[PDB]
Design a protein around this ligand. Structure first.
Ligand SMILES: OCC1=C[C@H](O)[C@H](F)[C@@H](O)[C@H]1O
Ligand SMILES: [Mg+2]
Length: 534
């Protein structure tokens, strides 16, 4: 266990750090907590009742360089200089992707769930009730549990906090993630699906006619799943109403299955647009502000509202939707924009947005059953552990590297891959990491052969999910060889050896792959790699 001058300098719930069992009785809340030794660190656990509000758990001097983590799929996991931080301007159309507590992020450096420095990890093991986050406030790192003004008549469990120390920072992050996995009964599938996804070629312009073209060609590729992305639906929330040349959602599943694939489908199940049938029928089903529908985000050139997952009517609707899809034969569900279900606001029941979120995703899991694969996307990470099988862990990739794209969550292969690297340790611990789709076509793309190889082989070494997204008629010998060689790199235990890198060069080893022990060194600025196989 770490002992030292820096440990004496910490405070836990406002008290000087030391081992033991404690009670803090304040005006508005009571905390009972223990500070206990664990392998390579300390664990702070306990229970809280009353109105804890934004509850300070830990305080310590901020490190100079910190690995910070955004709460959801698309947001950055990256090393930042804690002392030269300036607040970002928050996009009013996407504020809750930046932070569930935007008041923090507009003033102070924020990290959600965990934060790391060289030789040290601070990390919460769960987000079941509170949102756990860190802020750097006038040179101090402060760990908080946000309860969003909810009051608890009887004790509920704290989200446990671990403080881990060891010179091997990657080992610490892996250990943290194993503790999260155990705390939340993580689903780690024994088999990883391969497959095809429409989005990164066709986007919203997918037709059924092009879908069928790809379905036929897909029989020549090593694809298990055939997944229809955003395009088929008439509106956001109207998931069983199709548009354009698409047949019924049931019919699509039957054609896909008849052609020998596992049918997959995209939804944004916690989202309903201002124009949707479901919203116009059920205006009382959404999260509110001053009693009116609260915009969760703007996309598809529409205001999008969040379903209120505290309401039984809403949970019954979700259950019926996903049960219906399962009955049709879908067994792979990409469930997206899930942050919407955890937006702060007024709900029917006085529960946190995190409690609400977890009721929603648990309902989905019950509806699709145990033999359905759930891929989360645009999702709060820690609250989803135990429910999803796979999780998108980066911003969207793209059929271009993204030379002129900032690290701001806009699609770009370079930033998608950076997050697959810096969140590598969640893989096979929280869930299967989804690094986003391989784009292996050699027309209708600005990616080079070398860029396609660098992305693909990195994902292989990391043992991540391998989904291709292309017009398959434009994938020829190079693309077919890259996919084949990628799948030969799967099956190992990866480690990013230099996780605190600030120059976008990473050394990645993977032990026990289908190709033996491998190593790839990548440079995301020069777009070069060096791959070794044993
Ligand atoms: O709207 C479709 C869509 C939205 C998000 O950006 C996802 F991350 C992306 O993969 C696509 O599914
Ligand atoms: Mg594995």
């Amino acid at each position: 266990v770490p002992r030292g001058s820096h440990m004496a300098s910490m405070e836990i719930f406002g008290k000087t750090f030391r081992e033991g069992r404690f009670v803090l009785k304040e005006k508005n809340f009571t905390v009972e907590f223990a500070v206990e030794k664990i392998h390579l660190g300390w664990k702070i656990s306990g229970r809280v009742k009353g109105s804890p509000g934004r509850l300070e758990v830990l305080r310590t001097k901020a490190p100079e360089k910190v690995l910070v983590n955004n709460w959801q799929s698309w947001g950055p996991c990256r090393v930042v200089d804690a002392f030269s931080f300036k607040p970002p301007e928050i996009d009013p159309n996407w504020r809750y992707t930046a932070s569930v507590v935007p008041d923090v992020l507009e003033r102070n450096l924020q990290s959600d769930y965990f934060v790391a420095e060289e030789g040290k990890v601070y990390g919460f093991l769960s987000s079941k009730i509170a949102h756990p986050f860190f802020a750097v406030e006038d040179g101090e790192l402060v760990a908080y549990l946000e309860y969003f003004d909810v009051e608890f008549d009887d004790f509920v469990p704290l989200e446990p906090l671990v403080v881990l120390e060891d010179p091997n920072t990657p080992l610490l992050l892996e250990k943290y993630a194993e503790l999260v996995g155990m705390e939340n009964n993580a689903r780690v599938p024994k088999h990883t699906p391969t497959g095809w996804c429409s989005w990164y070629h066709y986007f919203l312009d997918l037709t059924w006619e092009e879908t069928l073209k790809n379905l036929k060609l897909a029989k020549n590729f090593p694809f298990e799943v055939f997944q229809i992305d955003d395009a088929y639906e008439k509106d956001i929330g109207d998931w069983l109403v199709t548009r354009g040349d698409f047949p019924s959602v049931e019919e699509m599943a039957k054609v896909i299955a008849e052609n020998g694939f596992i049918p997959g489908i995209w939804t944004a199940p916690f989202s309903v647009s201002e124009t949707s049938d479901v919203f116009n029928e059920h205006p009382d089903w959404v999260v509110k502000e001053n009693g009116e529908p609260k915009m969760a985000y703007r996309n598809w050139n529409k205001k999008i509202y969040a379903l209120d997952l505290s309401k039984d009517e809403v949970l019954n609707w979700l259950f019926d939707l996903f049960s219906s899809l399962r009955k049709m034969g879908y067994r792979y569900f990409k469930i997206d924009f899930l942050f919407a279900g955890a937006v702060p606001g007024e709900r029917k029941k006085n529960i946190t947005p995190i409690q609400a979120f977890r009721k929603g995703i648990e309902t989905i899991r019950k509806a699709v059953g145990e033999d359905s694969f759930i891929l989360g996307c645009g999702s709060p990470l820690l609250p989803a552990v135990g429910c999803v099988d796979g999780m998108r862990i980066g911003p969207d990739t793209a059929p271009f590297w993204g030379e002129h794209i900032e690290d701001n969550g806009a699609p770009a292969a370079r930033w998608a891959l950076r997050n697959a690297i810096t969140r590598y340790f969640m893989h096979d611990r929280f869930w299967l990491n989804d690094p986003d789709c391989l784009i292996l076509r050699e027309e209708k793309t600005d990616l080079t052969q070398k860029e396609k190889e660098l992305y693909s082989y990195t994902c292989g070494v990391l043992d991540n999910m391998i989904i291709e997204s292309d017009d398959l008629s434009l994938v020829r010998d190079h693309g077919k060889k890259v996919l084949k060689e990628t799948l030969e790199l799967l099956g190992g235990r990866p480690r990013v050896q230099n996780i605190m890198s600030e120059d976008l060069r990473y050394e990645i080893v993977s032990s026990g792959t289908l190709s033996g022990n491998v190593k790839i060194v990548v440079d995301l600025n020069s777009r070069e790699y060096h791959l070794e196989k044993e």
